[PDB]
Ligand binder design. Sequence first.
Ligand SMILES: Cc1cn([C@H]2C[C@H](OP(=O)(O)O)[C@@H](COP(=O)(O)O)O2)c(=O)[nH]c1=O
Ligand SMILES: [Ca+2]
Length: 137
Amino acid sequence: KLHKEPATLIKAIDGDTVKLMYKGQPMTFRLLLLVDTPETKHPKKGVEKYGPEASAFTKKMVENAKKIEVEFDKGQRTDKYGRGLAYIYADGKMVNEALVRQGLAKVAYVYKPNNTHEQHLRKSEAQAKKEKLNIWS
Ligand SMILES: Cc1cn([C@H]2C[C@H](OP(=O)(O)O)[C@@H](COP(=O)(O)O)O2)c(=O)[nH]c1=O
Ligand SMILES: [Ca+2]
């Protein structure tokens, strides 16, 4: 079973990459199962169509949260770049899914066993497509 753990915001970096104080140590966390478009991609040098709105949305959601919690999946907790891989919740709402529901990020990098909430995010993504939101307009 997965479970939520306390984390302190240190800084939001873009739509899907946030730096958090987790168990007393500063580290970059990357949101599982998403590809926010970037604010500072690498092919793209930077700023994507919808990458800066996905960044603003996560920035406000974590900045204004009363509390942040991280939820690791059941596979590896870290990727090759040493970023923590988690579902992040702000006030009990999953930032991963809110981005996807808004049509501000797409579901991507699905590596089992790290896909417990994959179907939940694919649903939210289907609805953002139906309603034609943002990247899907
Ligand atoms: C979300 C996620 C990304 N990644 C890797 C895939 C991509 O590697 P490559 O850089 O080699 O293409 C990169 C994309 O991350 P970003 O979207 O943050 O740039 O991070 C994982 O390995 N596992 C994951 O769960
Ligand atoms: Ca990104």
